[PDB]
Amino acid sequence: QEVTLRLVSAFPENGIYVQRLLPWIAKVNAEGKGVLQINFLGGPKAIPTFEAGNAVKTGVVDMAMNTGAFYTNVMPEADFLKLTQIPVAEQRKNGAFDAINKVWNEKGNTQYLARMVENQPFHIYTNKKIDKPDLSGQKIRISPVYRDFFQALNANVVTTPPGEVYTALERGVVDGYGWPIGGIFDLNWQEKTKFRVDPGFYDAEVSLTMNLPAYKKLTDAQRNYLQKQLLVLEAENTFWTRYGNVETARQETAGIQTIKFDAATSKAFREKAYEVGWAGAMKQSPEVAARFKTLFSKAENLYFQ
Numbered sequence: 579q580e581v582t583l584r585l586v587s588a589f590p591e592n593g594i595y596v597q598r599l600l601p602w603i604a605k606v607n608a609e610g611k612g613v614l615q616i617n618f619l620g621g622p623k624a625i626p627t628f629e630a631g632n633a634v635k636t637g638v639v640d641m642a643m644n645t646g647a648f649y650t651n652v653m654p655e656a657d658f659l660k661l662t663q664i665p666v667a668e669q670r671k672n673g674a675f676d677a678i679n680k681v682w683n684e685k686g687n688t689q690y691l692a693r694m695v696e697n698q699p700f701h702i703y704t705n706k707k708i709d710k711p712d713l714s715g716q717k718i719r720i721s722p723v724y725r726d727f728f729q730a731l732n733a734n735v736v737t738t739p740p741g742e743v744y745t746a747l748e749r750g751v752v753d754g755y756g757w758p759i760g761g762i763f764d765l766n767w768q769e770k771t772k773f774r775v776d777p778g779f780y781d782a783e784v785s786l787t788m789n790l791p792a793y794k795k796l797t798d799a800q801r802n803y804l805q806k807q808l809l810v811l812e813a814e815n816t817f818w819t820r821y822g823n824v825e826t827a828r829q830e831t832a833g834i835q836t837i838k839f840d841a842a843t844s845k846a847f848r849e850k851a852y853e854v855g856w857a858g859a860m861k862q863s864p865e866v867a868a869r870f871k872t873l874f875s876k877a878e879n880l881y882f883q
């Protein structure tokens with residue numbers, strides 16, 4: 579009657595995302611005895627960051643906390659969730675959530691369960707000051723989130739998982755990196771970060787996913803309980819707006835300088851991120867990308883303007 583599901587984190591255990599995950603697992607377990615439990619396996623030391631998506635697809639683990647940016651090896655469509663401009667509660671009402679799950683099911687043998695990070699724009703962080711929206715000469719650490727935009731800004735790019743960013747900065751292998759507004763202190767990157775470029779762009783996606791067979795094997799009661807707890811997790815996404823503000827102030831206090839462009843240049847920079855981001859998605863998966871685009875836009879922005 580009680581099922582135990584094995585869950586891995588693609589992010590380091592000392593980061594904010596695992597700090598959010600563990601109290602939720604604790605609640606699931608405390609309230610789920612006799613019904614459903616989650617066995618947290620650990621972070622990248624258990625399964626490498628870029629392998630967690632495949633581990634879920636193949637059932638080596640039941641569940642993961644991960645970003646689609648880390649499992650483009652399963653399906654390139656996985657990276658598209660950075661382009662959401664409505665929050666997950668609204669995605670559940672407008673068909674976006676179901677559309678995501680349809681693709682994840684078919685192309686990845688994966689059920690898309692919940693989004694536990696949103697309202698976290700991405701930024702360029704760098705040690706080489708710029709005064710225009712261009713990165714010529716710079717070598718920047720990335721995941722797939724940033725590839726299209728940073729290449730369009732003339733950056734050289736190199737892929738690393740989050741746990742190798744500190745080392746890349748320490749060795750001076752990169753001038754900078756992409757990351758959300760929040761979290762740069764968790765793995766001590768502030769030590770080697772001089773600037774953050776504004777504005778931010780896209781919206782970070784960190785979600786829970788599950789092996790599709792394992793999801794289908796749940797009893798109705800187990801699935802209903804899991805769903806209740808998944809919505810409980812998402813209801814706490816109000817945190818992210820607070821965290822963004824605190825982290826922005828924390829960077830200023832730490833002496834990280836904000837690079838700002840004028841109003842027109844800033845507006846065009848964020849527009850460019852979305853234009854090239856969607857153009858890349860469209861090349862990668864025309865039908866899925868086009869469909870997601872119509873479901874991911876703000877209600878106020880989806881028609882003629």
Ligand SMILES: O=C(O)C(=O)c1ccccc1
Binds near residue numbers: 648721723783784
């Ligand atoms: O820069 C990354 O590693 C990345 O892709 C990501 C995605 C979501 C949240 C934080 C980082």
Ligand SMILES: O=C(O)C(=O)c1ccccc1
Binds near residue numbers: 820
């Ligand atoms: O709201 C905060 O002060 C904040 O940034 C934070 C960070 C981690 C846990 C709790 C709060």
